[PDB]
Amino acid sequence: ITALIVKGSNTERFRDKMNDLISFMNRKKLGRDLRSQITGHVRLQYDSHYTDTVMLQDIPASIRAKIAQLLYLPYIKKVPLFKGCSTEFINQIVIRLHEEYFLPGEVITEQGNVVDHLYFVCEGLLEALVTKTDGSEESVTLLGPHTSFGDISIICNISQPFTVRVCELCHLLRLDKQSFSNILEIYFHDGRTILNNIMEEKESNDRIKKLESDIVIHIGKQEAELALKVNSAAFQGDFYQLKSLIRSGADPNKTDYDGRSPLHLAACRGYEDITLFLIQEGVDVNLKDKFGHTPLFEAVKAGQEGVIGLLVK
Amino acid sequence: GHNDYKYIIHPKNRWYKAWEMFILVWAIYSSLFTPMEFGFFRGLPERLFVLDIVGQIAFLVDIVLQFFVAYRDTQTYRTVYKPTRIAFRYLKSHFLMDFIGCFPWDLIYKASGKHELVRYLLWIRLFRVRKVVEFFQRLEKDTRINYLFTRILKLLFVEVYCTHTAACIFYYLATTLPPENEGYTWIGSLKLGDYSYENFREIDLWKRYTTALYFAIVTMATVGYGDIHAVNLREMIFVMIYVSFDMVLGAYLIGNITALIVKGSNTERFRDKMNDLISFMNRKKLGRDLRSQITGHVRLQYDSHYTDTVMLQDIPASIRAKIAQLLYLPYIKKVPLFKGCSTEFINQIVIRLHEEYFLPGEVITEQGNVVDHLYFVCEGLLEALVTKTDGSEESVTLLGPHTSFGDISIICNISQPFTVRVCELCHLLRLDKQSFSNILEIYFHDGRTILNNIMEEKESNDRIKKLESDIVIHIGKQEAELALKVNSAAFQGDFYQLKSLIRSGADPNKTDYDGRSPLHLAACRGYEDITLFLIQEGVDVNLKDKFGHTPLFEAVKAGQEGVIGLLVK
Amino acid sequence: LKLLFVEVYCTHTAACIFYYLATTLPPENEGYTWIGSLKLGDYSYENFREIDLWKRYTTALYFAIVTMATVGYGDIHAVNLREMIFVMIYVSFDMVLGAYLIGNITALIVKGSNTERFRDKMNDLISFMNRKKLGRDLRSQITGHVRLQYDSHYTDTVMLQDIPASIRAKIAQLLYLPYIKKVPLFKGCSTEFINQIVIRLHEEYFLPGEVITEQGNVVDHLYFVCEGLLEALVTKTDGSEESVTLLGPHTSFGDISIICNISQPFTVRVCELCHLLRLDKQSFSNILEIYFHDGRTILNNIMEEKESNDRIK
Amino acid sequence: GEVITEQGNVVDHLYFVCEGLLEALVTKTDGSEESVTLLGPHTSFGDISIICNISQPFTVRVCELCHLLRLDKQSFSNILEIYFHDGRTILNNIMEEKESNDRIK
């Protein structure tokens, strides 16, 4: 009997968690409203299976990805922003999602604020609020189940369109915007597809199109910018970072805005060993810059007998 | 529904709270008196009849009140004030039991020919003990009293109820037998001292109750003298049931108290670590000053509960951000390394910092050690050490509050060539290497501002001037990429984006890696507006590249007569 | 001990109060008290207020002690309602007291001891050895060494790594540094340097008769003998071992190879005891490579000390 | 399915695949990490990063339960510092064996 009592008690365990957080709040003199917020959400976790997530640590990240695709993926597919988006991007978004529950009244995001988190609503109902001239909320709309907020502040890179506060206990899957945009800068198709899904919203909302994004168009020339960075790295001489840039698929044959390849830069700076490694990758032997120069011209103009000999080879 | 209706009151309302404690008191009486009225009384005498009437009146009013109290719904976690839902909650949870026990069962037994079977419904009133249990639940919710200690207090209360009911039931079993076979009962054959419990229905109520409770209490502790024991088969059977159940209940009491002790206070964990290190002190014959210093860190680990952030992870990241913003932002804004930096970038900093405390004389970072963390100084004072001649006190400036260090190990990928040494208790703030790198890449503008801060910081603070020099190299490095971007923008056609870059402060004259300033590229593209913006900015219009190509050469090579005219102008 | 004192005091006070409640009835009704109606064997406590004090106190304390353990012989029991109520109160509070006594004792046992912690460690080790089916000689060596780890309590130096590196350093500076100063390999050197060596020292106690260093391996640790007598073995390639010298206290083996890039110069066999001080070879390289000129000096120190024995000569 | 190593991340263990089948992967542009090789029993990986003083050139995921043998970067480095010619025999064998799998080739 003593062993089973000592084993644990859910109420007791979350009770120690409250006592520790109370000590923390007391020492740091946290705000009374925020004190209520902490205690309320910790009582919520007493019922929000906080342990499951802590237990998932042992469960391998791949298995966590699969269970994520088993639970979040239906709900996030039903979200209208991701209809017709590549299934790989939605799998990526699902894997990095984090379960977060919220008590009624918890102002999770506030209008015109820095939004680093994109919240997908799964169970619950929320409020859209815009600050009035005096300061009162104007009750824009009610976020029902299976929506997503924080998106406008993220894609449009603007302040939060409206304060979101929940009427009821809700279940939102949090996404930090940093990694989100990073994948957006990788999944180009979903880049443009989410811009189309939000373009319908633009056709319904002026605030969105007001600050449109040129990210995908830049991506059309992101290959040129990458190649620019590669050529700069070849000028740097750091083989590690240079290789990493080539690892990104930066064919040495790719050129900058002026049509200059790393072969020319290796010739210019006497990077004979870089020239050898460019030869392993077979940079276009007579590739011309916008001044019409095959790499012999710079190889000899720098007089790099190693580069001259290698390119004559 | 709080304002939609007026008769409904909050479950935690003040007036209803007073009524709640009053009904708690009355539950304890009506749950500790019903066994007495059942066993010792075969029909209440007409002396406490008004007490029974008032007892049922109080719980009738409780029945009425439980139809006007709101309730926090389990699912929505919001208080629900729907009158129909309030009623449906009460009727389908514990209404019927509380309504049956509200009946005047005394008068029903008196009127119905004393059937003695109706009297058993008095035990339904025991369900009012629910109000006690509920109370203890509320008591276990508050952080005022330990969960285990409230558990043991509840167990003691349960033992009180069980022994009271056992005594009442034992005497009732004595009363089931007719007054002629009383010699075969546990009380009818009792001869404690020289007093004979012969007519055990004529003795005063309190003597009989105290005898029955005496047996129950000694049975509960299983001291079991033997002076009072069971005689009948009914008494034997009930004693066996009660004794087994009390074995289990007392075992739970011992288990709960033992679990409370085994959990222990952090005081004992700290005391025991103190103990094994005191042992080590005596085995190793340590110096007394050293001993006090060891006890120093021991007390620090007892005292510094900074690991509650590991609990804070459960609370959402927005709320965590808010807490960080109000405990770290004032300190971070005063760090000179972040002067000129954007507020969003600083907030993002503040979200990812961790607290760190160290005793005086301790060391956090070390020279020649690859450090993966940036530590800001907020309280206390610190002192790094660049060993230059065999660590001949080759220390570093006393690292005051509102500062930082280890930032150079991140900015220029250095091995952190100084051993920071603690002088007083400091609230150091920890930032991850990958974290700081990625946010730097998000806010490269603010990062360049950061190096523009470090240059002046270390020009006077020569202790980091050497690293400043290396950072100037890295400054050139960032200039390279930034320079290229500027030129790229002018070539790409991003006129407004190029304005944005220069508005952040991008140097326009900056040439690319082959000495081509963005003026060259804009002239080549033919962008009249970009070209005029660049010549206005101050880009050199005459500097040829490393290949003898002046901006005029770009203008005429591209043949853009507008750009040629602007450049000649 | 405090709880046992509470037990003793409570039983003594309970016996005194019980006898007092026997005295709260006039001698007319002594037969209705607990002691007045007491007839044990042949002695009748009829005129109990006239019996000798130590004959009444011992009886009352006998009742109290018996009820304290709840053995409840029943020969002495409560008769009055006064005594009934008091015995109820005492029995309940004694039940709580005994629960606390069992809880305190159980907590002390549950807390365990280095004996049981060692026992656990040994059980896992031998479980591992049989799991991987080692040989009895090898198992003997591991078990002997771990037993010695317990008996030397250098398994209990594991707690000091929790203590600050500065405080650990000073503890080492007071304990290890005495032996290290007497090691001529470090003679002539800055106190700071030997100080660092002592900072990175590890206590390594070994079997009195054993082998810890062999010849031709790659040095990874330096063992300064501070306690016990060891020996240096040079096994001739014909198949016969030869002990070159004895590696006693204040003598160092391994350092010769550690300083240079040569392999292990000789075997070491321990004879008397082995409180060895381990210094990681790679760590010794670190403290040499900081280059405070002390490495350059110890080079000369080795040069002057390379006449110890024919092997090193 | 465990991620043993990662491409571009320096790893300081030369694991010796000994009990099981591995799934050493290589991330491509499309986002799918194409396997550099499925290390089966009595195989090996990690030396390529160590001996060449580089990061791991492949993100290693796992096919089946794999028992492995850790060997520290610095220690092995110290070992090859003393034993160099043996290391040179390693380089010969790495060339000849990598011929087999064009991915490790």
Side-chain angles (χ1 to χ4, degrees), chain B residues 217-231:
Chain B
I217 290 309
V218 310
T219 296
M220 141 214 102
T222 82
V223 9
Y225 301 105
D227 65 323
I228 318 216
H229 57 83
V231 176

Side-chain angles (χ1 to χ4, degrees), chain C residues 18-37 43-57 80 82-83:
Chain C
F18 198 52
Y19 177 83
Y20 179 62
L21 296 178
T23 75
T24 59
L25 291 203
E28 315 145 0
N29 322 135
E30 58 194 349
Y32 192 31
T33 75
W34 68 269
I35 178 159
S37 77
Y43 203 78
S44 154
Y45 296 68
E46 187 67 357
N47 221 44
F48 79 91
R49 328 164 93 100
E50 218 181 24
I51 319 197
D52 183 37
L53 160 60
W54 294 113
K55 175 62 161 313
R56 290 146 26 191
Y57 176 59
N80 263 304
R82 300 168 168 76
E83 301 151 1

